[PDB]
Amino acid sequence: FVKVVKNKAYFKRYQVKFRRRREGKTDYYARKRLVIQDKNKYNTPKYRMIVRVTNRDIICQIAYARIEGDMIVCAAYAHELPKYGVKVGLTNYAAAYCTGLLLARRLLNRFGMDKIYEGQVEVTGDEYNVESIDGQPGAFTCYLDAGLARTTTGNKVFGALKGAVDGGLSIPHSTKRFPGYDSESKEFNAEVHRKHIMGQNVADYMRYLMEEDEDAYKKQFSQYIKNNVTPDMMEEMYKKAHAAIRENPVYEKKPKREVKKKRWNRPKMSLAQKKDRVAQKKASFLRAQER
């Protein structure tokens, strides 16, 4: 026949991966090259901005590594943008920029450095990077953490990076992966990037689609219709969201609810129960053989 490959020797010589690698979550190569602090820095924290794009929202965190685990000093989720005025479209480039701005502003406010480092108050899309002013405390510096995301031009992780840079974080970057960089001739214009930041590509798609056919338009934009946002409000709505974020970044935690203590899973069966189970099965089989 065929020599079975997964046998006792195979299993007892098998060597498992790390748990996160087995789940497929993280890349330990870049993990080690990114989070390990230089030894003569002597316990100085090293800061990542972890950016994750989900099927329905955007997660941004600031974290530094410790032996027991990673510490997260601040975090901004995209599903709290309606509180600031973005009703729909929570997983696009504009939403990523907004959540990066919210993360940066909340972190600066928590550190007490928000009056300093206003950043790009009025967005323009071109290259910008904050410089530390003398006498005042230095600018907060972190490094991007994209994870397994493929870092190609026009990525929402770079959208969030631009948002936080405008917020006032001193992150090292180049304007090569921003949308607006042309590959063939190697230039970067700020107007295309600003269109993407304002979501004007989405507005143009809405206009195009509603011009040609309305069945596909109602299919593909439906919550947009329910929250009755027209392609014309996009820019002013995003500007209002930016202003609201920059004027109030502090977070309000949801109140802790009282617990009724209902168990939804099944508790682990005990040794006596399973031994009685096997005895019962044996007895039932013997009885069936008897009849």
Partner: protein, 170 residues
């Protein structure tokens, strides 16, 4: 009730011509399947050197394409027109994919051209079910489970129920 997420669909259809040599005939075969599908084919080289076969390593000796969706169904039903919806039971893989081969391509309705010639095709259709992108996506790769797989007999039943074809034993 059958869950809608368990509807058999053809994931893709792979077409190839292995011509056995390199050059003008290979280019003409490339034009053949480009006309057949509508997309540029890709040339497959040789991994070794087999003297009795007349091929050296790294020599382009095959052409292939893959097609997905509407074009896949159209090409598949054209091939089943060619072989009158008649398949032998051995043509089915234990995974559920299947395939066949045609000796000559003008049976597909494409006009003959004197400067092109005659070529045979290998069709191979691989089926699927909503949720098979799990095994190949990047961010969190996993298996597909035992219930959700595809079986040989139910691949046959799907073929004979939607293409109303006939499966001859042997």
């Amino acid at each position: 009730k059958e869950n809608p997420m368990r509807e058999l669909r053809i994931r893709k259809l792979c077409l190839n011509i292995c011509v056995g040599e390199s050059g003008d005939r290979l280019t003409r075969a490339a034009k053949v399947l480009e006309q057949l599908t509508g997309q540029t084919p890709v040339f497959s080289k040789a991994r070794y050197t087999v003297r009795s076969f007349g091929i050296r390593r790294n020599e382009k000796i095959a052409v292939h394409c893959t097609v997905r969706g509407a074009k896949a169904e159209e090409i598949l039903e054209k091939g089943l027109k060619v072989r009158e919806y008649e398949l032998r039971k051995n043509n089915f893989s234990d995974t559920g994919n299947f395939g066949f081969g045609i000796q000559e391509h003008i049976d597909l309705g494409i006009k003959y051209d004197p400067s092109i010639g005659i070529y045979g095709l290998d069709f191979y259709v691989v089926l699927g079910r909503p949720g098979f992108s799990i095994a190949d996506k990047k961010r969190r790769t996993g298996c597909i489970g035992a219930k959700h797989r595809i079986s040989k007999e139910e691949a046959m039943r799907w073929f004979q129920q939607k293409y109303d074809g006939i499966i001859l034993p042997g």
